[PDB]
Amino acid sequence: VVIDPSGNTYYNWLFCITLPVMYNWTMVIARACFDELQSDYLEYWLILDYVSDIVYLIDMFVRTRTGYLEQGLLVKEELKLINKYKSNLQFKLDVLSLIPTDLLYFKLGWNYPEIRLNRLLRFSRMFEFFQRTETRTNYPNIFRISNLVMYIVIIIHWNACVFYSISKAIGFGNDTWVYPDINDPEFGRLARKYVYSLYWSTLTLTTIGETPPPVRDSEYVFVVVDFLIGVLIFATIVGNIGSMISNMNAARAEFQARIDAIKQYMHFRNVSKDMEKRVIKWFDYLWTNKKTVDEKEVLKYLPDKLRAEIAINVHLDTLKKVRIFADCEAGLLVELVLKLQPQVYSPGDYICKKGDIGREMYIIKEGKLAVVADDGVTQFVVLSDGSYFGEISILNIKGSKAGNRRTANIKSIGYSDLFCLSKDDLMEALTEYPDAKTMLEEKGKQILMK
Amino acid sequence: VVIDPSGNTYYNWLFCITLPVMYNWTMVIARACFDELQSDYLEYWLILDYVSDIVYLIDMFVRTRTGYLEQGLLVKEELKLINKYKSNLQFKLDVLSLIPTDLLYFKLGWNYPEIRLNRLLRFSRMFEFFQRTETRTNYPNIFRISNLVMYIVIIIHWNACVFYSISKAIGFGNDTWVYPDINDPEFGRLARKYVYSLYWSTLTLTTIGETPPPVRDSEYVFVVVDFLIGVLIFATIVGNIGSMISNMNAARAEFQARIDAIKQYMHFRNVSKDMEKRVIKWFDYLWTNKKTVDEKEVLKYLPDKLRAEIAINVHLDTLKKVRIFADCEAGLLVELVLKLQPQVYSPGDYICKKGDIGREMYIIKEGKLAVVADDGVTQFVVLSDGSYFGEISILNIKGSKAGNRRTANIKSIGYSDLFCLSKDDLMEALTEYPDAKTMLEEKGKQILMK
Amino acid sequence: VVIDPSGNTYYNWLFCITLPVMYNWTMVIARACFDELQSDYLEYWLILDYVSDIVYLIDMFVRTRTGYLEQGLLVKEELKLINKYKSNLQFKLDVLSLIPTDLLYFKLGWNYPEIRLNRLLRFSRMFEFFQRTETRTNYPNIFRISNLVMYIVIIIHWNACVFYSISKAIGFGNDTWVYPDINDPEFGRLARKYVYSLYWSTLTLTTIGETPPPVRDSEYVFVVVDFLIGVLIFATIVGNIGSMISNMNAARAEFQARIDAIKQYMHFRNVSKDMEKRVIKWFDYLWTNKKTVDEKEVLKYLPDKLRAEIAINVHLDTLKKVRIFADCEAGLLVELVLKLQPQVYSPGDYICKKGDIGREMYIIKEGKLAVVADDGVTQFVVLSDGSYFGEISILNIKGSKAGNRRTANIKSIGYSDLFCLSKDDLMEALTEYPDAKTMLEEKGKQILMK
Amino acid sequence: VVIDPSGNTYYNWLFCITLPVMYNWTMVIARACFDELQSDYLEYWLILDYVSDIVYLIDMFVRTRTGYLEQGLLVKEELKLINKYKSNLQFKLDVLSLIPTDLLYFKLGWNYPEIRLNRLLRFSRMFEFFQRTETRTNYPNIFRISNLVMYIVIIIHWNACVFYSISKAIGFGNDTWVYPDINDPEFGRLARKYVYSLYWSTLTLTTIGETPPPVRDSEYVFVVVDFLIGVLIFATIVGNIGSMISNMNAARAEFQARIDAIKQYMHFRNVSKDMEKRVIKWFDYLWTNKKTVDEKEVLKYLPDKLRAEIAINVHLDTLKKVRIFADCEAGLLVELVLKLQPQVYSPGDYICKKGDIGREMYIIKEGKLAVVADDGVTQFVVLSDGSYFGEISILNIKGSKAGNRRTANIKSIGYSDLFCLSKDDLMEALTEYPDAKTMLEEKGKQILMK
Lengths: 450, 450, 450, 450
Ligand SMILES: CC(C)CCC[C@@H](C)[C@H]1CC[C@H]2[C@@H]3CC=C4C[C@@H](O)CC[C@]4(C)[C@H]3CC[C@]12C
Ligand SMILES: [K+]
Ligand SMILES: [K+]
Ligand SMILES: [K+]
Prior knowledge:
Helix content of chain A: 55-70%
Shape of chain A: elongated
Entry title: Cryo-EM structure of human Apo CNGA1 channel in K+/Ca2+
Assembly: tetrameric
CATH superfamily of the domain at 298-449 in chain A: Jelly Rolls
Strand content of chain A: 5-15%
Number of helices of chain A: 17
CATH architecture of the domain at 298-449 in chain A: Sandwich
Strand order of the largest sheet of chain A: 3-10-5-8
CATH topology of the domain at 298-449 in chain A: Jelly Rolls
Chains A, B, C, D: cGMP-gated cation channel alpha-1
CATH class of the domain at 298-449 in chain A: Mainly Beta
Radius of gyration of chain A: 35 Å
Keywords: alpha-helical, membrane protein, ion channel
Oligomer: homotetramer
Largest sheet of chain A: 4 strands, antiparallel
Bound molecules: cholesterol, potassium ion
Order of helices and strands of chain A: HHHEEHHHHHHHHHHHHEEEEEEEEHH
PDB class: membrane protein
C-alpha cells in the first residue's frame, strides 16, 4: 500500500504532521525562554512533546510509503521507496529531528527544553503543507495572507522569546531596557512576561519603537539588529501583499491595457463615435460576462490530447446533429471539432447578408439568430442554439445552381457565440478521409437537387 | 419592465443602495460603541435607519427586476428573474440583512443599535457599486485611490470604535491606556470621545504608536493584534498604490523596454549614429503622438465582426474613392479593407523610387506625399490624404508595357501614415470574386492603353 | 517662426517656465503662512513675482508659437496656432494664472500673498517639463528619483506651511500642540519657524509621529488627516520606487526566467551535463555581452521602412562584397539584406561539415571561422569578418557537379555571429527580379565551370 | 597570460579586490568621524590601509591583464589590453583612488584618515563582484537579500558617522540632541560612541524616530533630511524585496493565470465536470513535476546550433534505434530530431485507436504504453521508453495493403511523454535527402511485404 503524493490522503497527512511541526516551532523556544511556562505545565509539555515525536515517527514511515513517479507510473515497491527516502536529505533531517535529546533532561534538568530544538528540522513538512494548500484551495490569496500572518506571528513570538532571554541573561530589571523584575507581582506573572515580551517584539519588528531605549551596548546592538530585522520583515510583508495584489488584478490590468490600446487606436484613426461606443460596450460585455480570455490562446496551454478531449466534449454533439456530418466516421468528426472557430456577435450584428460570400458554416452555441428579410426587421425564422446554417456553402458540389453566396440575411438577436467551420478547414480535414469527402459531397448534391 | 444590469439605471441604483450600506457600515458600530452618539441623536438615527431599511427593500425588489443574460438575450420573465434571485446566496444575505432586529429595541433598550449589524450583510451592493465605478469612470486610478482611502477610513473608524468599547469594558480612566474618564468636561464630550478614539486608531493602524502604552494584559494583547492589523493595512495600502503605479506606467515601461532593446541592437550592430538618431527620433514621435501601439496587434483583440466594422468605418470611403475599385461589389471592398496594412513614414522617407518593384498600392491617410524628380528636391505633385498611387501595379494586366516597376519617386513630406494593399493581398481577396477580378483587370487594361 | 515641440528649444523653454512655476508653488504658500517671510523680503518677493509673471506672459506667447502636427507636418500658421491655443483649456488656465490679483495688495495689504495662488495654475508647464525630461535624459531613473524627492519635499513644505497656519489660527503657544509662542527669542525667529514647521511636517507625513500630541479637537482631526495623507505619501513613494526597481531589473528577470525554463527543460529531459554547461555558458555570454535580445523580435518593433534602413546600414556593404551579388541591382540587394538571418556560434561550433546539406549562404560579421580538415584541428583558411562562404550552394545552377553538400568543415574559432541567406530566401527575393535570377545563375555556372 | 573575465579566476579576484573596497567604504569614514577609533588602533589601520593599497595596485595590474572579447575571440595582446584599460574611465578612477593622500598624514596629522576617501573610488570592483555573484550563485535571492542588507548597514553606518561628526562639530553634550559629553565614563567609551551613533542612525533611517528631538536649526534641517533619506531607503528596501518576491513567484503567477483562464473557458463552455477535473489534475501534475514550461517555447530562446545540439543529445539515440532510420545518414537524422514534437499523455489516454488515421510516428520517452484490445483492458504488449510505433504509417510506400489507419489500440499506462514524427515532417526533412527517401520507402516496402 502506497500513498499518492498528489491525493487527498497525502494532503491530510501533511496537515497532521504540520500540527506538531508548528507546535515545536512555536513552543520549544517559548518554554526555553520563559522558564515558568516550561516548569508550570511540564506534564502537558511531556504529553505534547511525545505525541509530536510519535507523529514524527509516523511521518518518517509515511515518507517510506510515499510513491514517487517513475516512467509516468507511481513507484510502489517498498525497496525503491525506502531507497529514495534514505538517499534523500529529508531522511537525514528527519533522523536528526528524531535524535533523542530528551535524554539530556536527566543531565541538564527539566528547565532545558532547548534540547528539543532539533524537532524544528521537520520544517519541510510544514512548508510542504503550505505549498500544497496554496495550490489546492479555492482561496489562494486568503490562505496566502493567513500564511504570511502565521509567519509574522511566529517571527514576532521568536523575537519576544529572544528579548526575554536577553533580559534574563542581563538580569531582569537591572536596567530600564530589559524586561523588569520578575519578583514584582505584576511583571512576575507568566501571562505578563509573555504578553509584554510579545508587545516589545511587535513594537520592534514593526518599526514602531515605543520601547524603553537601550541602556547597555549589547542592548544597543540587539535593538539595532532587531530594528533592521523588523524593517526587512515589514518590507517582506509589503512585498508579498503587493505581489498578491498585482496578481489579483493582473487580469483586469491586461484587459484594461487592451481596452486603452484600442481606445488609442480608435481616437487616433478617427473611428466614428458610434463604433467607438460599440467597441466600449463590447469590452464591457466581455468583462461583465467573464469572456475576456481568447478561446484559442487559452486552449493553446492544453496538450493536444486534452485540448481535443475538451473540444469533443464541447462540440461533438452539435457537430453530429448537422445533417451532412450525420453519418461520417468519428475520426473525421474529431478532426472537424478541432477546427471550429468561435465567432461571437453583438445584438443586431449580421452574420450573413444575401449576397455575401458563403465560405463558412456556422453552428449556434448559446445564441439566437434571426433569418430576416432585406428590410432587416421581418424575422422569417429564429435559429436557436444547436442549430446551424451554411453547411452546403462549405461543400464542393459539382453542378451547384446557387453557390458561393448567402441566400439569407442571418442576424444576431444578441450575443450569439457562433462556431464556424470554413470550407478550407473542411477540405484540410477531409484530405485524410477521401470516402468521407465523396460521401459528403454526394449528400450535399442530394440536398441541392431536392 | 426589467433593468439592464449593464445600463445607467442599474449603476444609479447601485449608488442609491450603496448610500445606506455605507451609512450602516459606518454608523451602526459608531452608535453601538459611542453611547452618547446613539442616545443623543436617536431621532435622526431612527429616521435614517428606517430610510435605509426601505432602500434595502427596494434593493431586493430591484434585484427581482434585474435581468440576467441567457442565450445572449436579457431574461425579462418575472418568474425566471425571481427564481434566479431566490436561488442565489444574495437573496439569503438580503433577507438576513432585513430581518427585523429593531424589535430588540423594546427588550434591550435604545442603547443597543448593535442589533442593526445585520444590515452590514448588504456589503455586496457597495462592493458591486465600487467594482462598476472602477470599470466605468474616466479616472480609474483617482477612484481607486478614493476607494482605498474610503476602506482605510472605515477600518480606522471601526478600530476607533473598538478601542472605545474596550476602554468602556475595562473602565474609562481605570488605567492610563484606556480612554480617560468620561466624567471629565473635556474627555466626556462626544466630539472628543470620537476624535481621540479616531486619533488612537490612526496612530495604531498606521504603526506610528504614539499612544499611552498598555497597562493590562488584554491591553497588551489588543495592542499587539492592532499593530499587526495596522502593519497588514499599511502593506495593503502600499501594495494597492504600487500595483496602481505599475499599471499606470506599464505602457511607458514596455515602450522604453522596446526602445532600450533597439538601442542595444543598434549599438551592438554598430548602426551608424545617423540612423541611430533617426530611430530615437522615430520613437520619440511615436510616444509624443500616442501611436506606440501596433495597429495589427491592437485590432487582434477585437472580434472578427467588430474588427471588420472598425476597418470599414476607417478605410471604406478612401478605398471606394480609388478608380479601379469604384464600381466593385461591397463584399470585395470589405475583404480588401480588411487587408490594408498601415505603413508610417518619416519626413523625407521615400515610399517609392523610380525603378523600385511596384507590388503594392498605397492610400494616403493623414499625410502628404510629394512626387519628386531624380534629384529629389523638385516636387511635381503633392499627394494629400485620401489620395493614392500604385493601383495599376497590383493588377495582373495582360500585355502591360511598363509594369512591376515604379515610374515615380514618391517621398514623404512628413509622417505620412500610408495604408498599403499588396498584389498578393488583392489576389487572395479576388479568389472568391472572379467577375470582380476580370472587371478589375479589364479596367486596368483600359487605364494602361489610354 | 514656430517652435518644434519636440526640439531642444521647446525643452529649454519648458525648463525656463518651470522655474517660476516651481517658485510660485513653493514660495506663495510659504509667504502666505510665514508672515515674516513675506514682510521681511518683500522687495525680493516683488522682483521675483513680477519676473515670474513676465515669464508666464512669455509662456503664453510661446504657446501661441508652438506648432502642432497636422497631416504629419508642423502647423506654422499664426491663425491656426492661436486658434488651437485659445480653444484649449490650457489657455483658460494661463489666463486665470495671469489674472492680476496683486491689485488686492492695495486692499488686503502686503501680508496677503495668497492672492498669487492663481499662479499655481501653470502647473501644466512644470509637469510637462518633467514628463519631457523623463523621456529625454540618459538617466531616467535618477531623474525619476529626483522628481519624486521634489514632489515629496514640496508636499512636506506645503504641510509645514499648513501646520504653521493652523498654529497661527489657533494661537501660537495656546496649547502644547501648536507651534510655540513666536514672542520667544528662539521660536520667534523665522528660520526656526520654518525649520520646526518642516520638521513637524516631516515627522507627520513620514508617519514617525514624534510630535507633541493634539490638545484640541481640530488638532486631533488635522493630525488624523495628516497621518493618513502621510501614509498615502509613503505608500506612493514605495510604489514609485518599487515600480522603478521592477522596470530596472525586468530585463534581467525575463532573461533569468528564460534561463530557468531552459534549465528546467534540460534537467527534466536529462540533457547531458556537458551540454547543460554549454547552455549555461552561452547564456552567461549573452548577458555579459548585452546580446540577450533577439534581433528579429527587436526589429519587429521598427516600421518596415526604418527596419529596412537599419538592415541596409548594417548589411548592404558586406552583401555587395559577395561576388555573385557584385553587379545586381539595388532593389534586389535590399530585398536580400532584409532576409539575412543572424546565426551566432560558440567557440568550436561547426557551422558546416563536409557532407552537410548546403542550402544556406553565410556572411561573417564580427567573427573568425576556420576552414578545417576532417580531423578538425588543422586550419586551412581563417575566414574573418566580411568574408563569406556557401554562395554557390544557394544557386540553382543547371548541371552542377558537386551540389547540395558542403565540401569544407567550417568551424567557429569563437563567437562568430554569422548572417545567413538561405536558398528559399534567395528564391523568394528573386521572384520579382527574373533577369537578376538568370544573371546570378549564369554567374554561378561560370564560377563552377572554372 | 590573460584572465578570462568570465572565468573563475576573475571572479575570485573580484572577491579579493572587493575586500579592501568594502574595508575602505566602511572604515575610512568610521575612523574619520570616531577619532578614538582612528588613534587607538592606528597600527592596525596602517597595516590594513597599505594592504588595501597593495591590493588596489594588483587590481590595476589585473585590469591590464583582463582580456576583452574582440571578433568573438579573447584579446590577449598586452598593448591592446593596456590601451583599452588606460582609455577607460575606470583607469582614471583607479589612479585617483591610488593617489597618495597618506602624505597629508605628515601635514594634517594622524587624526585625518579622510585623506583616504579617494580609495572609495574603487567602488566599481565591489559593484562588479556583486553583479557577478548575482548571475553566478545558486541562490540569487538569498544573495540579493544579503547584498541589500549590506548596502543598508553601510548606509546606516555612514549616517551614524555623520551624526557623530555633526555632534562633534556642534559640541558633545552642548544640547540634548547631539551625542552626549564624551568626557562621561559611559558615553566617552568608543564602543558606546559607535553603538549609540549606529542606534541613532537606525532609528532615523528606518523612520522609527525615538531619538531626542533637535534643538538647533541645523539639527532640525539635518533630521528632516535624514528622515527623508530614511524614507527613501525604506522605500528602496521594500521595492527591492517586492521586486524579488514578484520574480520569485512570477512563474507560479503565470501558471495560475493559465489555469484560471482555462477554468473560465471550461465553466463558460460548460465543459463536463469530469473533463474539468481531468484538466485540473493535468495542471496539478504539470506543476508538481516541474513541466509547466512548453518545450517548444523554451527551446526557442536557444540559438539554432545550440537547440540542435540539445535536440541531438536528447533524441538522436532513440531515433537511431528505429529500424527504418537505422542506416540513414547523420544529417537526415539531425533534421528529423529537430522535428520531433513532444506529446504528453495522461494515464488511460489513448494515443491511437484501431481505425484512427495513422499520419504520425511515436517514440516513447519516459513512459509506458499498452497495446490493448478493443475492450481496452487486455494488454497485448507493454511498450516502454525507447520503444516506438507507427514508423510505417509515415512512409509513402507504393502498394500498401493496410495504410493510413492504426491497427492497434495504444493506451497510456500513465504520463507517457511521447515524441512524435509526423508524415509531413518526414517529407519536409527528406526533401533534401532523395536517396534517403527512396531507401526509407524501399525498407518500408520490405517491412510490409514481410
Ligand atoms: C506563537 C504564538 C501564536 C503562540 C503563543 C504561545 C505561548 C507562548 C503563549 C500564548 C498563550 C499563553 C498562555 C495564555 C494564558 C496563560 C494562563 C495564565 O494564567 C498563565 C500563563 C498562560 C498559560 C500563558 C503562557 C504563555 C502562552 C502559553
Ligand atoms: K513608524
Ligand atoms: K514612533
Ligand atoms: K514611530
